[PDB]
């Protein structure tokens, strides 16, 4: 009573470096059996020249897997390959391995030989202990468990040829029962030692021509082959990708047989199949296809298919499609079950059955081939729908059978709201690793599930995946960056900018994201009573809307909250918050001191209370002087208002002594420009007369002032005084002090640590230059919006991209409506686009490392 699915798969098979190459060979009808000298001189000892072999055994990203080089040279290639294939298989499922660490996830590996362990133990004087650690069969599973921190069962099992499908049947049982949430299931087989082939030849088990002629009259033995295959199973609840569901699996053993231990009992094979179908409530009628063991043997093939005839065809009207992967690539012995499995799932994902090779004349000892009750797939056929069975048998008598219900979910009808641009992250071991995943994005941008899933696997520790990239999909250009990443952890700082960041139609672009639009609608709910709507102000044809002080104050705050609402939804929590002027209202909200209604109302009243009040005229100017040298050369009346950098400082004072300090300053050609303030001298004693009206209004808005965290640095209160009762809370008192006191901005930037990532939360990034000049060189500075820029959603995505690029983990899936998993059938494979760093080349045992 727990539904088990096949979530993810990867492999290397003969002439197939990954499952895309394997699929190309299958649907292409390319024989993957070869007669070159890769493993040993062809014909040696009178052996068949033909065998299925891997393109390469020498490559292993040793350092990603925490394997030191001395250890990698003395590790069974089986394991080196299975670590890579196992990683491949998990992420293929759209599952971040991190999510399975520390869980009771189990590992089961079919493996029948470590030829390598004999090779590397031959010379006592120069052998290495690490060779025990890298070749002992338990490790073919125990190493997987160790690397992935999987704490369920970790078991290497031998039932000869049925071993890997038995591993499937065990992982299945462990998940059906609740013992395990998930399970990695492996099959491995290599042909390093020729003496092993000689054994099989002399037993009469090998076709001289190296061909599994499955189901054919001339079947006279099998072709030995290599395989490395990994499959992730999960309970349905955890799945994103779902190739198929396991309706049922089981194993029996032939037991006693007159004919001998290695004669395959079709009667007992039949017993096994009969036990799994009607008794479990599954009709043979519901099978479209059976993957037979199909080794192409005088005895095996008739025993097997006559079994299939009596157990399944006997209770069917339609013919049963049958096939065997062994025709295509040979028998990879214990890996047979999982090789056969991948052929079945690739066929289903592509909507076409790959055909057998070598099916010329049917085996006349098999009635159901001659009367068409069993119909060999000898030519690509469309997948018409139905369950799938798979057989795997060992020479000792172990039988396994697995029923699959293929996943047939179609993707949903395209919507108008998804014509939005999307953002794709990727991490990687190499530049090519990232470029390839991002190229798969571009190619399949309309596939919501694929992109969603690629985003999930991008969140990775940076010591392991030192290259990151993003790209924006759904936009005219080629928005993409990729780079090396830091290692050291990178604190995230929010800077909420102040005034001068307003512009006509600001935030209209972002109103397509729902978290943003929903923040603006909440903000509108605060100021409905006070007779204004932020949505309508953003929507204003009218050029001078944000010339009204209340319109600007409520809207800049409203948007700063909406941006903080987006960042929060993609998982970004600030380590430090710094405000500038009006900024300190949003900072409050970021820091969780101000509710959203408090923050938005605070901004309205700060505005309304300045409108209503009669204040001594002053002016404000920006001047190319430092904090200090400005105080020196200042008239009386004129005060340094905003300490921005050591380059820029904003002054305030009376309209006369300012429009005289600009001119006396341009004699010396110095940066000096009076700013539009509607004739108010902010951050000075000219604002003192706002305190009575505003302190009352805010007292009624911020009823129960809440503590400010150590993460929010005041720019309104000097550091010396951060311990005061005023600075304790975002009080009505705090927000009045803000308007009449200087902005101690540079003073606070000093406190931003090394390697920090600094985001300017503002509808235009005014403070970029200032921030750069004010914070340490290490620190990365990132804007979120710019005025009159064609698409601001594209600019936001682009800049979220830049955050992911710093090694800070961002998951953009949350910006758009969630994908409904399981992912639709035919979502593209991820396993083939996981590139490694194969720069190094590792020892492989060779024929002469074994005796003669
Ligand atoms: C399948 O039953 C053939 C025998 C498996 C042993 C392979 C490795 C020694």
Numbering used by the authors: 1 to 852
Text taken from the publication that reported this structure:
De novo fatty acid biosynthesis in humans is accomplished by a multidomain protein, the Type I fatty acid synthase (FAS). However, FAS is overexpressed in cancer cells and correlates with tumor malignancy, which makes FAS an attractive selective therapeutic target in tumorigenesis.
Herein, we present a crystal structure of the condensing part of murine FAS, highly homologous to human FAS, with octanoyl moieties covalently bound to the transferase (MAT—malonyl‐/acetyltransferase) and the condensation (KS—β‐ketoacyl synthase) domain. The MAT domain binds the octanoyl moiety in a novel (unique) conformation, which reflects the pronounced conformational dynamics of the substrate‐binding site responsible for the MAT substrate promiscuity. In contrast, the KS binding pocket just subtly adapts to the octanoyl moiety upon substrate binding. Besides the rigid domain structure, we found a positive cooperative effect in the substrate binding of the KS domain by a comprehensive enzyme kinetic study. These structural and mechanistic findings contribute significantly to our understanding of the mode of action of FAS and may guide future rational inhibitor designs.
